[model samples]
Target: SQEVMKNLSLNFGKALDECKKEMTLTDAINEDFYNFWKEGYEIKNRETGCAIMCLSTKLNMLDPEGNLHHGNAMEFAKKHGADETMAQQLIDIVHGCEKSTPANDDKCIWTLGVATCFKAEIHKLNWAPSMDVAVGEILAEV
Candidate 1:
């Protein structure tokens, strides 16, 4: 369910405030970027992508190579509320997205593409939560 996925990803927002200030972006990421799972919201800021990488690193979801660490990422999902099957499914989708997205030395750009692809895939799965509700949860956490 979208809500289940939302709860799983909500942990990502837990460290968001703490990790966000670490990156003093040149061109700041848009406020709408926070509503990434929302319909029609796009991730256009390359800096925001780098921010994601840094945040993932802080969360220990990324490995030394700046790639998703499957085991840790799965544990994150489990910590948030996902069962093993659900967590593994999220990992599978992220893996496919990473492979399918084009290569780029600029990790920020590459991650943005992967994230955009992930968002679309989640939408295709009809698993996007309502933006209003999602935003409220995020704000509450922060």
Candidate 2:
């Protein structure tokens, strides 16, 4: 369900906190950073991208080359639920976002691009769950 995926993204955004505590980052994301999935809102801070990459990096979602590792991602898509061909489709969207986004020299900036593009596409596909409702479900899990 979109809400499950929403939950993942919820955790994904907040791990910006985990990253700050886990490792040293030049800057931290704003408390509103968790609201990236909210409609019409944009992530303006480049360091938030850096902070996000820190969590993604720790999760092994990227290879050393800063590319999305589909095998790892696809494999875990099952672990996270939404397993099957649908998961593959979602991963493909993510991979496509990675490919289309430029500026690899700065992984943080690049990550923001990839994430934003993916967010846009997911919205188009109607895969975005209501963040207000979605937040409560994920919040309950915590």
Candidate 3:
């Protein structure tokens, strides 16, 4: 029985390794996808360096279980405010939904606020801190 369990554990570890390779985005899902979404980055569109441009980050924070409980209402409201009460209400609603149904918890809502404030600093660097599968290998870690 012990040998059998050991074999199973070894196989499970192998399976985990494979999953890590295939699911390179796993750690992102586990944490800080929101920060990545909020952080700004610069990219060169054309071959020429002249075409550099800045863009806002986005996230796939809403994980499987089909839940939607995260986001910074104030930040989301301020940046893309097509409507005021509606935006904030949406924020509150998502929070409520998260509280009501935890399986649908938001991964990145709080990070959005942090991102909003750090925009200038992020832009100056022009690269994300968490840029690797290891999660902390990028500039953001610093």
Highest lDDT: give the candidate number.
2
Best candidate, TM-score: 1
Error of 2 at 56 (Å): 0.9
Positional deviation of 124 in candidate 2, in angstroms? Answer: 3.0
Taking the tens digit of each residue's C-alpha lDDT, what string does model 3 give over 34-68?
A: 23333363321121111000001111121122121
Clashes of each: 0, 0, 3
How good is model 2 by TM-score?
Answer: 0.59
Q: TM-scores across all candidates? A: 0.60, 0.59, 0.22
Cα deviation at 101, candidate 1, in Å, is: 0.9
Q: Tell me the tens digit of each residue's lDDT in model 1 across 5-109.
A: 433343444445555567666433434346555566565767767656655545332223332342344433434445566544445666677888897688777
Off by over 4 Å in 1: 1-23, 30-32, 60-70, 73-76, 126-142
lDDT of each: 0.50, 0.51, 0.26
Regions of model 3 farther than 4 Å from truth: 1-23, 26-81, 103-142
How much does each candidate deviate from the true structure in C-alpha RMSD?
A: 8.4, 8.6, 17.2
Number of the candidate with higher TM-score, 2 or 3: 2
